[PDB]
Amino acid sequence: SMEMDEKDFAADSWSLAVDSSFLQQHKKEVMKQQDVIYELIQTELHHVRTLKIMTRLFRTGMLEELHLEPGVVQGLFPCVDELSDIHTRFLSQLLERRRQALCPGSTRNFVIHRLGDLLISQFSGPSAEQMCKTYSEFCSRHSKALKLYKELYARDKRFQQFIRKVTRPAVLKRHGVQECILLVTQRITKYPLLISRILQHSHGIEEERQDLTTALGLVKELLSNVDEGIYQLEKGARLQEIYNR
Amino acid sequence: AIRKKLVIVGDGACGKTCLLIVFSKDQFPEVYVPTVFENYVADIEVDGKQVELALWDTAGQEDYDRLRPLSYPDTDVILMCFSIDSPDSLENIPEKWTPEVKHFCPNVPIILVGNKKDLRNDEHTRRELAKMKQEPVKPEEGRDMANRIGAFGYMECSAKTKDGVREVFEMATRAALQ
Ligand SMILES: CNC(=O)c1ccc(S(N)(=O)=O)cc1
Ligand SMILES: CNC(=O)c1ccc(S(N)(=O)=O)cc1
Ligand SMILES: CNC(=O)c1ccc(S(N)(=O)=O)cc1
Ligand SMILES: CNC(=O)c1ccc(S(N)(=O)=O)cc1
């Protein structure tokens, strides 16, 4: 992540991120709604950061330092460039909505009143089709990636030294290779939980309650489709084991 | 320190997310209780042994039968949760959660955990349950279910008051080491 966004999302909540004199001007229901929107953007910033650790620290570090056989790095980090493009674009739209809502003279005081439309756009059309195709591929390659990782760590000395080196810093404590893969697979199922809680505090404007209800439906459609499109790939699987599923 | 993996399972609203949040922060949040839990790696020292215990939630995966099992690879200990204010969350333990965990995590210890124990003596909870001819889960009902499903043990806690929370994770670390 970049320092500017990290500082904007350093606080535990929206109520602690804005100035107390700005917080005091709002009703409790507005504060409850903004606290959950803040959590959605903060966890999205962290998810994009997880993808950057996978692409820049691990994937590119292995290509530049190690002599792994072709197709091994892609097997460890399936779809990471596509996932990074989807989420970095989504994060850009969330952060621009926050930035446009800032009061003049402030870099921290804002209220996002219109999130629903942004979520409908993200979870419909070509961007939603791409999310469905990419997670169906990623989640079907998840187990193979973990097994390839464990095999390489147990048998290759230079690979083990590389992993131990780049994961040593305390800031990487939660972000080993296997941890990043599961954080990405779990991201998509966090969206309905966050959207439902935002919706719970968005009844004041009927247009907004309706837009968030539509967005929640679209996210559930994405999850149902991804869940139906998953079949675990296994290295060395035989055709007979596949057609006898 | 040795690295172990913990995963918590249970129905939606069994309190699994809150339990992970309270343990990982060592506090019930005073200003904002998060909606979701990403992951966490706890430094735990139990009975003279140092462990890095990675914590994972299955919240949000309850309706997705092909996504959910991706949380299980290499799990060392399962916390199987139910809420004491929800006798229905306990009924789903033997014929939904238990067969799933035994299939994907063979030989992994399961600790059955009764969450929200503070609601056993909450009058609003007793009134609401009495309208459906129900009462909060009794301690013997929790122990009997744990005995029946082959659990390593039975424990209770309250994320709201923090009572019992540390003990659940210390015992989970001991189970993961066995
Ligand atoms: C109006 N609905 C859409 O445009 C749409 C497009 C794609 C999906 S998917 N492939 O489940 O993520 C859902 C909805
Ligand atoms: C006083 N308790 C709360 O405000 C609260 C808020 C949210 C949760 S959650 N989304 O289930 O983890 C729990 C408790
Ligand atoms: C030894 N005194 C302590 O207070 C203490 C507190 C907590 C732990 S644990 N089991 O790492 O979470 C250990 C020791
Ligand atoms: C789609 N499901 C999987 O790929 C999968 C799910 C779970 C496992 S486990 N927990 O190691 O037995 C392996 C593979």
Q: Using CA atoms, how far apart are residues A133 and A226, in angstroms rounded to an integer?
A: 8
> By what technique were these coordinates determined?
X-ray
DSSP chain B: -EEEEEEEE--TTSSHHHHHHHHHHTS--SS---S----EEEEEEETTEEEEEEEEE-TT-TT-TTTGGGG-TT-SEEEEEEETT-HHHHHHIIIIIHHHHHHHSTT--EEEEEE-GGGGG-HHHHHHHHTTT--PPPHHHHHHHHHHHT-SEEEE--TTT-TTHHHHHHHHHHHHH-
For residue A236, what is the DSSP state?
Answer: T
Please, what is the end-to-end C-alpha distance for chain A in angstroms? 42
Q: What backbone torsions phi and psi does residue A178 show, to the nearest 5 degrees?
A: -65, -40
Helix (H) or strand (E) holding A217: helix A206-228
C-alpha angle with apex B79: A195 to A141, nearest 5 degrees? 60
Q: Which residue of A has its CA nearest to B66?
A: A227
Q: Using CA atoms, how far apart are residues A131 and A192, in angstroms rounded to an integer?
A: 15
- Return the beta strands (E) in A25-132 as ranges: none
Give the closest-approach CA distance of A228 to chain B in angstroms: 7
Please, what is the end-to-end C-alpha distance for chain B in angstroms? 15
Chain B residues within an 8 Å CB radius of A192: 60
- Contact criterion met (CB below 8 Å) for A79 and A134: yes
C-alpha angle with apex B63: A243 to A199, nearest 5 degrees? 140
Pick from B25, B64, B68 the residue to mutate for testing the A interface (most A CBs within 10 Å).
B64
The beta-carbon neighbor of A12 closest among B32, B57, B65 is: B32
Cα–Cα distances in Å, from B40 out to A5, A72, B130? 22, 28, 38
Q: What backbone torsions phi and psi does residue B78 show, to the nearest 5 degrees?
A: -110, 130
CATH code, domain carrying B85: 3.40.50.300
Strands B110-115 and B153-156: parallel
> What is the residue range of B19's domain?
3-177
Is the C-beta atom of B167 inside 6 A of ligand 3?
Answer: no
Q: Which two tokens stand for residue A153?
A: 């760590």
Distance of CA B168 to the CA centre of its chain: 9
Q: Which two tokens stand for residue B170?
A: 């210390």
Strands B49-57 and B110-115: unpaired
Within 10 A of A105 (CB to CB), how many other CB atoms are there?
6
Contact assignment for B31 to A197 by CB distance below 8 Å: no
- Contact criterion met (CB below 8 Å) for B55 and B3: no
Q: Using CA atoms, how far apart are residues B14 and A96, in angstroms rounded to an integer?
A: 36
Q: Using CA atoms, how far apart are residues B83 and B89, in angstroms rounded to an integer?
A: 6
CA contacts within 13 A on the Cβ side of A44: 21
Q: Among candidates A218, A242, A207, which has minimal Cα distance to A121?
A: A218
Strands B77-83 and B2-9: parallel
B130 contacts chain A (CB < 8 A): no
Ligand nearest to the Cα of B74, by number: 4
Q: Using CA atoms, how far apart are residues A182 and B5, in angstroms rounded to an integer?
A: 12
Chain A residues within an 8 Å CB radius of B38: 43, 46, 174, 183, 186
Is the C-beta atom of B137 inside 6 A of ligand 2?
Answer: no
Give the closest-approach CA distance of A33 to chain B in angstroms: 12
Chain B residues within an 8 Å CB radius of A12: 29, 31-32
- Contact criterion met (CB below 8 Å) for A134 and A82: yes
Q: Taking an 8 Å Cβ-Cβ cutoff, which residues of chain A contact chain B?
A: 12-13, 15-16, 35-36, 39, 43, 46, 139, 142-143, 146, 173-174, 178-179, 182-183, 185-186, 188-190, 192-194, 197, 223-224, 226-228, 230
For residue B113, the one-letter residue type is V
Q: Position of tokens 């600790």?
A: B111
Q: How many structural domains does chain B have?
A: 1
Q: Using CA atoms, how far apart are residues A90 and A96, in angstroms rounded to an integer?
A: 10
CA contacts within 13 A on the Cβ side of A172: 17
Chain A residues within an 8 Å CB radius of B40: 174
Cα–Cα distances in Å, from A104 out to A21, A109, B66, B107? 15, 9, 48, 60
